Design a protein around this nucleic acid. Sequence first.
RNA 1: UCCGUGAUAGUUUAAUGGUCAGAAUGGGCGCUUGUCGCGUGCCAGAUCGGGGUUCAAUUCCCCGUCGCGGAGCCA
RNA 2: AAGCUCCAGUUUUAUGAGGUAAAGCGAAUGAUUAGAGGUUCCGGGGUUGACCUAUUCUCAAACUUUAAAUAUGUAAGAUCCUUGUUACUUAAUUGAACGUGGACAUUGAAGAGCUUUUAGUGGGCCAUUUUUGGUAAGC
RNA 3: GAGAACAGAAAUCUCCAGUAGAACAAAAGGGUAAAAGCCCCCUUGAUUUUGAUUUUCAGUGUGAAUACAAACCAUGAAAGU
RNA 4: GGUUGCGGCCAUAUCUACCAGAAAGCACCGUUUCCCGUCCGAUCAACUGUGUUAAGCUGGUAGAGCCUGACCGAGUAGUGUAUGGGUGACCAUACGCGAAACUCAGGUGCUGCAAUCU
Lengths: 168, 297, 160, 181
Amino acid sequence: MSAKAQNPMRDLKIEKLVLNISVGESGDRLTRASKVLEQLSGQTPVQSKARYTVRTFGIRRNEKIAVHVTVRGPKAEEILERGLKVKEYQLRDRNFSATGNFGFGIDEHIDLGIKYDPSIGIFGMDFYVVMNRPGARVTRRKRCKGTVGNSHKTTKEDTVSWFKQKYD
Amino acid sequence: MAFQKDAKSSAYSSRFQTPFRRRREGKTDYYQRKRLVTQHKAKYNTPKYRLVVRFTNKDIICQIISSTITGDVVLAAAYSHELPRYGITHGLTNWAAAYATGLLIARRTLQRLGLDETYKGVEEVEGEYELTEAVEDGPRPFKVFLDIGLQRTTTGARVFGALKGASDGGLYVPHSENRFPGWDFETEEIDPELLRSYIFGGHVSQYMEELADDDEERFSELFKGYLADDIDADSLEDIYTSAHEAIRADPAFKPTEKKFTKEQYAAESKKYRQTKLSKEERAARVAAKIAALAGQQ
Amino acid sequence: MGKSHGYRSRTRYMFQRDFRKHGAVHLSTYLKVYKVGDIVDIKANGSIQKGMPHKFYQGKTGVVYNVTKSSVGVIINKMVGNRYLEKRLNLRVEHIKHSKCRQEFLERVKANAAKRAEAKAQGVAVQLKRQPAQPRESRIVSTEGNVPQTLAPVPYETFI
Amino acid sequence: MARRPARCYRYQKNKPYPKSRYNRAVPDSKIRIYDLGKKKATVDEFPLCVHLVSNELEQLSSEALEAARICANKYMTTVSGRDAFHLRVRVHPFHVLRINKMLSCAGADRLQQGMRGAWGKPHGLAARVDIGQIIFSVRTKDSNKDVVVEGLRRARYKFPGQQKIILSKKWGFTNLDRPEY
RNA sequence: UCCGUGAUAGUUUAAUGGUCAGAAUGGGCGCUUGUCGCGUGCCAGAUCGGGGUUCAAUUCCCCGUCGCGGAGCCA
RNA sequence: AAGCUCCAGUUUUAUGAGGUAAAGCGAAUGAUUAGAGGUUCCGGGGUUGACCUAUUCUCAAACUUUAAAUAUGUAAGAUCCUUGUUACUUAAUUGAACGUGGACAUUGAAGAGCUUUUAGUGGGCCAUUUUUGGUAAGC
RNA sequence: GAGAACAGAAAUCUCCAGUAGAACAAAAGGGUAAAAGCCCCCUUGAUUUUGAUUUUCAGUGUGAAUACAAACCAUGAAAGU
RNA sequence: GGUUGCGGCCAUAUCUACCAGAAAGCACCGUUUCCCGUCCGAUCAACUGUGUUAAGCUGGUAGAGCCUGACCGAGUAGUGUAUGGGUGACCAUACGCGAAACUCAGGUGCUGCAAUCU
């Protein structure tokens, strides 16, 4: 038979959590909401550059409009643990993408954190959770790019099933 | 779903046309390739990573390849799998394994071969240690030119260690001393230039020195014993073999080859499929197979 | 008067390649080196940027007279006027392609040439052609004096 | 409109010209619509299809095209009523006409200089209609065959290129066209 | 008709470096004042229609619509 | 002209190229249009289901690229070996290709090469074919 | 296209699908996907000398270009460029 | 039956269901302390194997895309060459040539060298 069974590979993993704050300097501050991100993630964020034309103020495209953190691995999991815990649940399926991705928004202030040490804050910043299968590097790694098929792509049903399994 | 490509096609069809099997496969860059060949010195391909991906993390390979009309001809090759025939039990993936494979391919290129030779001036350059690259040559290096493939120029990356193995091998290769995975990085002994360090052979020594459960067969001293074996002149490989048996052979490969489709025509399976499709249409009618099948009545 | 004269004008059909030829050219073609006396067409590939001849020269056949570094020196003849001179063109190998026609021509005459030798020994196919070729000739053969003899009619008196 | 017979236009002038960069502000297409009658109807109800085909190689004026097609349409829609059968114009009008536009008397001739001189200022649209080409393709029912034929007659005195009415065959006839289901 | 020259709030006209638009009046808003008005505080534009380029167009091209000036020969 | 000296063409082969008709890309007037997923607004009723935009498979001809152009004029293009000695670019390294020195063996017909000096322009015209402007014209 | 409170201009970031339709200062058109494009570092060879030759122009200059060799360095693993 | 190095022809190999190089001729995963990538070992740069065939390369199997041909369209459109007819424009004629669809077919690659196999 075409092949039913149980294997971990054919499993889900946390590809990354990108915490990205889209503010816009001078309103709140230069990049100083980075201090909020810095506590929340545990790591240094990098500046987000615009290219973009907008339109409104923002006509420079070289400057720091925003700030972002890419966490992967255990670093990603520790933020997911606190991050999931605020936001109650059983949160909705609509928040989830076609991709097997979900994101939610909320203040940095939420999370176990000193409010005093962050000089400014802000709602906010999409918590974005990328989930994908192990096979994923075939598109991601340079050399031998190969697209991901529909099979190998994660589903909204799989992501919800996996995430709902733990810490929900 | 998307094809997307099928509706747009012609242009979409253009996309292969530009590469061949090698870019689709994803190894080789034609501009990177270009730079070596025009010049008529051979490409010394040392893929370390990403072959298809035909190695890494278990193995490495080095071949010195030249061009010809029929296509590229490999003059000689060396595999790190063959390296334990000379004697070396430890991991094929490391620096010492890369250096020694690098000597092997150079020893196989010279071979003193062709009737033709190249015993003089100085082969053997010993397995050494080698402070900076000494050739009687001096500035001349040719008949071998480094083809990294994808693999990066990081000082301290294997790909380069094979080239240095070659240099000490009797092929004499263009190089810059600041770029090497240097002499102590194979180990051997080290270093000049702005860049520093002073162990990486020999990092496995230091890694092992830090306590943890790893592979067996001891510690630092074992690189030296087998590296010492590697120093030796002992050339001339090989094997030979069982051979094949009959005929066109394998258990997977037969349901996985055959009759329809051949190199020739899959007349039988296409015709079985047409006739089946046709009976299935006769009974239901609506959609063909592919989603449309209708007309105004 | 008006407009330009100009290298790039009128190129659109010649410069452009087929849907099939489109995409980067293959470095094998770039790599190729040739010998003197080889016969090579010149017609620029659109997909190479530099090394390109005057546009007006494409579709002509020349013989590689000599080479001096990466690009090669081609003899070709243009047309029209008085006492027109043969030209040297510096034209790259990417733009220069072999010509099959002389190669198969050479094999056929040479393949034939063996068949004859045996006939010269023991056989009489001919006979008339046999009579000039033994009496005839050195030059040594292979010389640069024959080139002006060819050069001289290219400025044609009648056409003029 | 402004006179010039069609002595000016009918013979096959000009390396075309109607290219989109090279002519801002052409005067309009005056053709009211190309398909007529039952637009909401497939070809297949109609057992009869009649065509009108050229003997000459010409450029037909936009005004002649609309005038011939409206003259045919008034005959069709008066006799067969408003929700009649169905007509398609074969040839749309997109060849662009230059003519130089009425000087002056300033002794200012052409004031230009002496002149004239390309970039002539556009007079409107025409259609190429070459030999054996089909101006109208009309789909109908045999008990109104006569009506479409007089509509095609009343069309002919409103273009100058000489044309013939004809009964079509194409693929099939109309019933070798129909047996596969 | 050619070549020149323009147009911005109810109206007349300032203005720019490609990222930012005004004044003055007229009006609508109160207070003055017996009461209106003058005065005195307060207020508010699809930059002619049009398509295009760009990162971003009031600003840079291209056309029209209108209002202007300047030509106009030897019959 | 005056002299000097004793090779030219063409089918056939091969190359790449005008072009202009119906597809592809880009532009696209510009209809007709069924089927059919989705915009975005309000607005009435018992999730459904009237209302405008609009993918998507899908249909009449034009025009500038490109296939394959089809064409047709074109339109350039028609000695070998061995021996020794020298060179050469390119690892004290691999090769060819140079040059020499020596030996060996191979349908056409004067349409024709070069030089000195010389003259009249340095304002054309018509037709045929292919045009481009011009309503046209013994333009 | 989807996904993310707020945001419309909304960059932003994320995922998929994505072969020359993008980018390549500037006309036109052509042309290219580990690219000649995009990024990061490092740097000055935008050096001096001579220029075979073509375009100029079929023989006629400036100019331009395509190739060198000498002289000199760069980056680069180096070939090379 | 050939997996794979290095290629060449480079639209006969673009795209979307699913079977196979594999008990010591892969990919993966795991050490990601580190030379190394950083903004996260992801990228990459390195050291290695619990074992797993799921993807990967590529082989097995199906359509729109496409080359190549056969079949009509059948020498049709067009065309240099010589010329008759038409009021004009336009047409034909002999001399040599000859595209568009149609349907059917072949192919979801080819070819060469080596790492050379159970």
